[PDB]
Protein backbone atom coordinates (compact mmCIF):
# COMPACT_ATOMS: atom_id res chain seq x y z
CA UNK A 1 0.00 0.00 0.00
CA UNK A 2 1.79 3.10 1.30
CA UNK A 3 2.22 5.41 4.28
CA UNK A 4 -1.07 5.40 6.22
CA UNK A 5 -2.65 3.56 3.27
CA UNK A 6 -4.09 1.12 5.80
CA UNK A 7 -5.68 3.87 7.90
CA UNK A 8 -9.15 3.13 6.52
CA UNK A 9 -8.63 -0.66 6.74
CA UNK A 10 -9.73 -2.83 9.64
CA UNK A 11 -7.51 -3.06 12.71
CA UNK A 12 -6.61 -6.64 11.90
CA UNK A 13 -5.82 -5.86 8.26
CA UNK A 14 -3.77 -2.82 9.24
CA UNK A 15 -1.35 -4.91 11.29
CA UNK A 16 0.47 -6.13 8.18
CA UNK A 17 1.68 -2.54 7.57
CA UNK A 18 3.08 -1.63 10.98
CA UNK A 19 6.61 -1.33 9.61
CA UNK A 20 5.47 1.16 6.98
CA UNK A 21 4.63 3.73 9.63
CA UNK A 22 7.29 2.61 12.12
CA UNK A 23 9.88 4.00 9.72
CA UNK A 24 9.78 7.75 8.97
CA UNK A 25 16.17 28.24 11.71
CA UNK A 26 12.74 26.70 11.27
CA UNK A 27 14.36 23.69 9.63
CA UNK A 28 16.43 23.12 12.76
CA UNK A 29 13.33 23.35 14.92
CA UNK A 30 11.61 20.84 12.66
CA UNK A 31 14.52 18.44 13.06
CA UNK A 32 14.62 18.70 16.85
CA UNK A 33 10.86 18.29 17.09
CA UNK A 34 10.94 15.15 14.95
CA UNK A 35 13.48 13.67 17.35
CA UNK A 36 11.40 14.48 20.42
CA UNK A 37 8.34 12.99 18.76
CA UNK A 38 10.16 9.75 17.95
CA UNK A 39 11.74 9.37 21.37
CA UNK A 40 8.50 9.97 23.24
CA UNK A 41 7.03 6.72 21.99
CA UNK A 42 10.29 4.78 22.12
CA UNK A 43 10.68 5.77 25.75
CA UNK A 44 7.34 4.21 26.56
CA UNK A 45 8.26 1.00 24.77
CA UNK A 46 11.54 0.77 26.68
CA UNK A 47 9.71 1.16 29.99
CA UNK A 48 7.08 -1.41 28.99
CA UNK A 49 9.72 -3.98 28.00
CA UNK A 50 8.37 -3.81 24.45
CA UNK A 51 11.45 -2.24 22.89
CA UNK A 52 12.43 -3.73 19.55
CA UNK A 53 8.93 -5.14 18.98
CA UNK A 54 6.15 -4.02 16.64
CA UNK A 55 3.62 -6.15 18.55
CA UNK A 56 4.04 -6.64 22.28
CA UNK A 57 1.77 -8.71 24.51
CA UNK A 58 1.55 -7.73 28.18
CA UNK A 59 0.34 -9.23 31.47
CA UNK A 60 -2.33 -6.56 31.97
CA UNK A 61 -5.91 -7.97 31.82
CA UNK A 62 -8.44 -6.09 29.75
CA UNK A 63 -10.97 -4.20 31.84
CA UNK A 64 -14.38 -4.47 30.18
CA UNK A 65 -15.29 -0.93 31.24
CA UNK A 66 -12.73 0.37 28.72
CA UNK A 67 -14.68 -1.45 26.02
CA UNK A 68 -17.31 -4.20 26.06
CA UNK A 69 -16.68 -5.05 22.42
CA UNK A 70 -16.00 -8.59 21.21
CA UNK A 71 -12.77 -9.36 19.39
CA UNK A 72 -14.63 -9.56 16.08
CA UNK A 73 -16.25 -6.22 16.84
CA UNK A 74 -12.81 -4.72 17.34
CA UNK A 75 -10.45 -6.48 14.94
CA UNK A 76 -12.77 -7.12 11.98
CA UNK A 77 -15.15 -4.19 12.34
CA UNK A 78 -12.98 -1.16 13.23
CA UNK A 79 -10.30 1.14 11.98
CA UNK A 80 -7.52 2.12 14.35
CA UNK A 81 -8.74 5.72 14.07
CA UNK A 82 -12.11 4.75 15.50
CA UNK A 83 -10.53 2.62 18.19
CA UNK A 84 -8.34 5.41 19.48
CA UNK A 85 -11.37 7.61 19.92
CA UNK A 86 -13.26 4.92 21.84
CA UNK A 87 -10.53 4.57 24.46
CA UNK A 88 -9.10 8.08 24.31
CA UNK A 89 -10.14 8.65 27.93
CA UNK A 90 -8.50 5.42 29.12
CA UNK A 91 -5.24 5.46 27.20
CA UNK A 92 -3.13 7.00 29.95
CA UNK A 93 -4.67 4.66 32.51
CA UNK A 94 -3.70 1.66 30.43
CA UNK A 95 -0.19 2.98 29.98
CA UNK A 96 0.39 3.24 33.72
CA UNK A 97 -0.87 -0.29 34.31
CA UNK A 98 1.56 -1.66 31.76
CA UNK A 99 4.44 0.11 33.49
CA UNK A 100 3.47 -1.24 36.89
CA UNK A 101 3.26 -4.76 35.53
CA UNK A 102 6.66 -4.55 33.87
CA UNK A 103 8.38 -3.38 36.99
CA UNK A 104 6.95 -6.25 38.98
CA UNK A 105 8.08 -8.67 36.29
CA UNK A 106 11.61 -7.25 36.34
CA UNK A 107 11.68 -7.68 40.10
CA UNK A 108 10.33 -11.22 39.98
CA UNK A 109 12.85 -12.35 37.37
CA UNK A 110 15.62 -10.90 39.52
CA UNK A 111 14.39 -12.86 42.53
CA UNK A 112 14.18 -16.04 40.48
CA UNK A 113 17.80 -15.67 39.45
CA UNK A 114 18.81 -14.91 43.06
CA UNK A 115 17.27 -18.24 44.09
CA UNK A 116 18.96 -20.00 41.18
Amino acid at each position, epitope marked *: LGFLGAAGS*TMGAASITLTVQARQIKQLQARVLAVEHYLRDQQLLGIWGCSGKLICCTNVPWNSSWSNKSL*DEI*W*N*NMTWL*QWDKEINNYTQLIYRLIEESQNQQEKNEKELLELD
Partner: nanobody
Amino acid sequence: GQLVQSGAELKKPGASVKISCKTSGYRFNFYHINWIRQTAGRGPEWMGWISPYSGDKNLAPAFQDRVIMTTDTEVPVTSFTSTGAAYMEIRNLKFDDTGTYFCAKGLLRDGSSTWLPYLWGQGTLLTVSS
Protein backbone atom coordinates in the same frame (compact mmCIF):
# COMPACT_ATOMS: atom_id res chain seq x y z
CA GLY B 1 -27.92 2.13 12.08
CA GLN B 2 -31.23 2.01 10.17
CA LEU B 3 -32.53 0.75 6.82
CA VAL B 4 -35.71 2.10 5.17
CA GLN B 5 -37.52 0.44 2.24
CA SER B 6 -39.99 1.52 -0.45
CA GLY B 7 -43.62 1.00 0.55
CA ALA B 8 -45.83 -1.83 -0.68
CA GLU B 9 -46.88 -1.81 -4.33
CA LEU B 10 -49.42 -3.67 -6.50
CA LYS B 11 -48.33 -5.05 -9.88
CA LYS B 12 -49.77 -6.96 -12.82
CA PRO B 13 -48.02 -10.23 -13.90
CA GLY B 14 -45.03 -9.67 -16.17
CA ALA B 15 -44.51 -6.16 -14.76
CA SER B 16 -41.16 -4.98 -13.45
CA VAL B 17 -40.79 -3.52 -9.94
CA LYS B 18 -38.07 -1.41 -8.34
CA ILE B 19 -37.48 -1.43 -4.57
CA SER B 20 -35.29 1.15 -2.81
CA CYS B 21 -33.37 0.74 0.44
CA LYS B 22 -32.32 4.02 2.04
CA THR B 23 -29.62 3.80 4.67
CA SER B 24 -28.35 5.95 7.53
CA GLY B 25 -26.28 5.96 10.73
CA TYR B 26 -23.38 3.88 9.37
CA ARG B 27 -20.96 4.01 6.45
CA PHE B 28 -22.81 2.76 3.41
CA ASN B 29 -19.67 1.59 1.61
CA PHE B 30 -18.35 -0.36 4.59
CA TYR B 31 -20.88 -3.22 4.48
CA HIS B 32 -22.49 -5.54 1.92
CA ILE B 33 -26.12 -4.91 1.03
CA ASN B 34 -28.17 -8.11 1.03
CA TRP B 35 -31.62 -8.79 -0.36
CA ILE B 36 -33.87 -11.49 1.09
CA ARG B 37 -37.30 -12.68 -0.06
CA GLN B 38 -39.96 -14.30 2.10
CA THR B 39 -42.94 -16.15 0.61
CA ALA B 40 -45.33 -18.37 2.57
CA GLY B 41 -45.02 -21.22 0.05
CA ARG B 42 -41.20 -21.10 -0.08
CA GLY B 43 -39.99 -19.74 3.24
CA PRO B 44 -37.01 -17.31 3.22
CA GLU B 45 -34.89 -17.20 0.05
CA TRP B 46 -31.55 -15.55 -0.67
CA MET B 47 -31.68 -13.10 -3.58
CA GLY B 48 -27.98 -12.38 -3.47
CA TRP B 49 -26.03 -9.30 -2.45
CA ILE B 50 -24.26 -6.26 -3.88
CA SER B 51 -21.13 -4.55 -2.59
CA PRO B 52 -21.57 -0.74 -2.38
CA TYR B 53 -17.80 -0.37 -2.54
CA SER B 54 -16.58 -2.44 -5.48
CA GLY B 55 -19.95 -2.78 -7.21
CA ASP B 56 -19.44 -6.57 -7.19
CA LYS B 57 -22.60 -8.61 -6.90
CA ASN B 58 -23.51 -12.22 -6.21
CA LEU B 59 -26.96 -13.28 -7.36
CA ALA B 60 -28.32 -16.66 -6.31
CA PRO B 61 -28.79 -19.00 -9.37
CA ALA B 62 -32.57 -18.73 -9.06
CA PHE B 63 -32.47 -14.96 -9.61
CA GLN B 64 -29.52 -14.45 -11.97
CA ASP B 65 -31.73 -13.95 -15.03
CA ARG B 66 -34.39 -11.79 -13.36
CA VAL B 67 -32.79 -9.56 -10.72
CA ILE B 68 -30.68 -6.44 -11.20
CA MET B 69 -28.92 -4.68 -8.31
CA THR B 70 -27.38 -1.20 -8.18
CA THR B 71 -26.36 1.36 -5.55
CA ASP B 72 -26.11 5.14 -5.15
CA THR B 73 -22.87 6.93 -4.41
CA GLU B 74 -22.71 7.52 -0.65
CA VAL B 75 -23.10 11.00 0.80
CA PRO B 76 -21.13 11.46 4.08
CA VAL B 77 -22.65 12.92 7.25
CA THR B 78 -19.82 12.39 9.72
CA SER B 79 -16.34 11.03 9.25
CA PHE B 80 -17.69 7.64 10.38
CA THR B 81 -21.28 7.66 9.07
CA SER B 82 -22.98 8.26 5.73
CA THR B 83 -26.24 8.03 3.84
CA GLY B 84 -27.12 6.37 0.56
CA ALA B 85 -29.44 3.85 -1.00
CA ALA B 86 -29.46 0.47 -2.66
CA TYR B 87 -31.93 -0.52 -5.34
CA MET B 88 -33.18 -3.81 -6.66
CA GLU B 89 -35.20 -4.48 -9.78
CA ILE B 90 -37.20 -7.62 -10.46
CA ARG B 91 -38.16 -8.42 -14.05
CA ASN B 92 -41.12 -10.51 -15.23
CA LEU B 93 -43.05 -10.78 -11.95
CA LYS B 94 -45.06 -13.93 -11.26
CA PHE B 95 -47.66 -14.77 -8.60
CA ASP B 96 -44.92 -16.87 -6.99
CA ASP B 97 -42.92 -13.67 -6.45
CA THR B 98 -45.42 -12.22 -3.98
CA GLY B 99 -44.66 -11.70 -0.30
CA THR B 100 -42.34 -9.55 1.82
CA TYR B 101 -39.01 -8.30 0.46
CA PHE B 102 -36.22 -7.30 2.82
CA CYS B 103 -33.11 -5.15 2.69
CA ALA B 104 -30.26 -6.05 5.03
CA LYS B 105 -26.62 -5.10 5.68
CA GLY B 106 -23.44 -7.09 6.37
CA LEU B 107 -22.32 -7.89 9.93
CA LEU B 108 -18.56 -7.17 9.74
CA ARG B 109 -16.12 -5.27 7.56
CA ASP B 110 -13.94 -8.40 7.45
CA GLY B 111 -13.80 -12.08 8.40
CA SER B 112 -15.78 -15.05 7.07
CA SER B 113 -19.09 -13.63 8.32
CA THR B 114 -18.72 -10.19 6.75
CA TRP B 115 -21.77 -10.32 4.50
CA LEU B 116 -24.26 -11.79 6.98
CA PRO B 117 -27.52 -9.75 7.14
CA TYR B 118 -27.09 -8.35 10.63
CA LEU B 119 -29.39 -5.35 10.28
CA TRP B 120 -32.74 -5.62 8.53
CA GLY B 121 -35.22 -3.09 7.21
CA GLN B 122 -38.87 -3.43 8.21
CA GLY B 123 -39.58 -5.14 4.88
CA THR B 124 -42.47 -4.37 2.55
CA LEU B 125 -45.07 -6.35 0.62
CA LEU B 126 -45.18 -7.01 -3.08
CA THR B 127 -48.54 -8.05 -4.49
CA VAL B 128 -49.37 -9.48 -7.90
CA SER B 129 -52.93 -9.56 -9.25
CA SER B 130 -54.64 -10.14 -12.60
